[PDB]
Design a protein around this ligand. Structure first.
Ligand SMILES: Nc1ncnc2c1ncn2[C@@H]1O[C@H](CSCC[C@H](N)C(=O)O)[C@@H](O)[C@H]1O
Ligand SMILES: Nc1ncnc2c1ncn2[C@@H]1O[C@H](CSCC[C@H](N)C(=O)O)[C@@H](O)[C@H]1O
Lengths: 55, 262, 262, 51
């Protein structure tokens, strides 16, 4: 998971690939179905599971 | 030793500047304060000599003033500098935007004779303009920390885009709790009612930290704020209540009128 | 085709974000607006298919409204998108901070059915906090465009750090000239005197564009502003005129006082 | 020459810190002329763009 996210955040090729077809890119990088489901529902808590407070 | 404080942006890995990443890479030691564990893994691959400043926050229900937390962060940073280490502080976003640790560290390092500097970063405010398609120049921009807006006398210009940072702890005067209360937020709404109607639409904004994550852009009337789900990363945006009106006094001094404006 | 608007920061080469540099690299075509020729050379090595938006500014003394300049920039960007090109606009600093071209291009692209987005960048404001060691959160922050501050009704909070952008054209109502006049700046000084004394120290700030260049941090009383040497890249910072004062009405509703503040 | 070095320096924090310790030595080692170095030390951006 962490490997994919770090690549995706840095690589504008991959980023535009991901936006075209998120599920296909995520499957192609090995993400599980629960990991993909976590992404498509926006559940960041489960994603961290699966892997300043004041001025 | 020396000190450079950088920001890493809000998004994982890609929102740090090219120079700032290079500073992290080449550092003797890094003191970090990052939004999550994905960001922390990325940093440790960049440079394995990381000391997480998170450890100095109150642990396990324990009562701790956040100013004592920051002091310990600042002191830990300066210890590496005083020892002789080429030291980098890697904070999320922009290290000097609503963040005191780096400013205090640089002031202290400079006073003890050490080279210290701050490299600007991409802050949550910078993310907001892009995510919401708002230019701060359109009708002006005001930023305040929410609690300071309550504790001290600030007058907002209701024609601007107004930001209240750290809205989730608005009115939490002891600086020992992670969140405020709904009655505190109701007092904020009544205070804000001097300038904004109760049905005035405001926006709870949260910039995304991961590249698979959409930003939070939640629109709601101002009256409903005390019932809303707020997080430490939440910023409250209050759009203008009022459109720009002509300043005839100055236009006359300039010898022009409205339909002369280009 | 599609549209991504990025920023390159203020400093040469190193202040662009890692992701934003990658967007430029992989683009079909880039439309640029950069501070100088060193920045332009750096961009052309990244991606040789660059169209310099500078060409659309008034050339050779011609009278031209800046609004027609920006329209032509927006139209040129959209033409590449409509043709089918994966298009990037690379503006200096943050592309949506006191800059209309990218916001207008994205708005127009979205309405014609094209994917358009804005990536935040490091703006001149972000550079100022770092260069001057000022946190916008300390006592709050206000930004206005200087001419809008004159032409329309804005009330500044004199406890905040106040910025007037594009100070060099303050009061230049036609948007056909590159600079204003000292009589206009004197009218601004008199307007500002409602809140700031004539001997109030202000700062003319210019972030550096080159890595061998120190920033401009020129301190002078407000009265001397009309005689000062201003450039298009100059921003006027006006530090607080008043200290923060306690807001007794709200503190009482909160049931606390000054001595209870953390 | 000049433009190479500046892009070089703006991106590379090692070179940046090398430059901060000894600006003249780093600049000479990267081939900058005396007029170019003088422009840098006096802060004359007009002349740097000329050169
Ligand atoms: N992801 C995010 N989205 C929106 N605002 C955020 C945010 N993360 C932090 N903030 C704002 O910043 C406050 C913490 S202060 C730290 C700010 C950070 N230096 C920056 O550059 O943005 C939060 O209370 C919130 O108001
Ligand atoms: N190098 C610089 N230092 C300080 N302010 C600057 C600057 N370059 C541009 N500005 C400010 O921005 C105005 C032009 S509008 C462009 C702003 C740019 N998008 C940014 O991110 O900053 C100038 O009039 C000045 O007020």
């Amino acid at each position: 998971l962490s490997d994919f996210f770090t690549q995706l955040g840095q690589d504008a090729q991959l980023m535009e690939d991901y936006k075209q077809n998120p599920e296909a890119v995520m499957r192609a990088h090995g993400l599980t179905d629960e990991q993909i489901n976590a992404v498509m529902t926006g559940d960041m808590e489960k994603l961290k599971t699966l892997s300043y407070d004041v001025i | 030793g020396s000190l450079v404080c950088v920001g890493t942006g809000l998004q994982l890995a890609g929102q740090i500047s090219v120079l700032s990443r290079s500073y992290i890479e080449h550092a003797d030691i890094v003191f970090s304060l990052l939004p999550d564990g994905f960001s922390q893994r990325w940093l440790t691959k960049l440079n394995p000599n990381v000391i997480n400043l998170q450890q100095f926050y109150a642990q396990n229900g324990e009562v701790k003033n956040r100013r004592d937390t920051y002091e310990q962060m600042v002191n830990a940073i300066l210890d590496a500098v005083r020892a002789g280490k080429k030291t980098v502080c890697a904070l999320y976003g922009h290290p000097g935007v609503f963040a005191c640790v780096s400013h205090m560290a640089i002031t202290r390092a400079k006073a003890e004779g050490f080279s210290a500097k701050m490299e600007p970063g991409i802050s949550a405010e910078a993310c907001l303009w892009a995510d919401l398609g708002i230019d701060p120049g359109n009708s002006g921009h005001q930023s305040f920390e929410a609690s300071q807006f309550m504790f001290f006398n600030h007058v907002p210009d209701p024609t601007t885009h107004l930001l209240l940072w750290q809205i989730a702890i608005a009115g939490e005067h002891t600086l020992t709790q992670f969140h405020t209360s709904s009655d505190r937020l109701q007092i904020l709404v009544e205070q804000l009612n001097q300038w904004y109607p109760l049905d005035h639409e405001v926006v709870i904004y949260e910039a995304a930290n991961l590249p698979i994550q959409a930003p939070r852009i939640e629109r709601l009337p101002l009256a409903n704020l005390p019932q809303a789900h707020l997080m430490p990363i939440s910023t409250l945006l209050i759009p203008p209540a009022k459109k720009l009106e002509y300043n005839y006094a100055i236009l006359a001094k300039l010898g022009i009128g409205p339909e002369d404006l280009g």
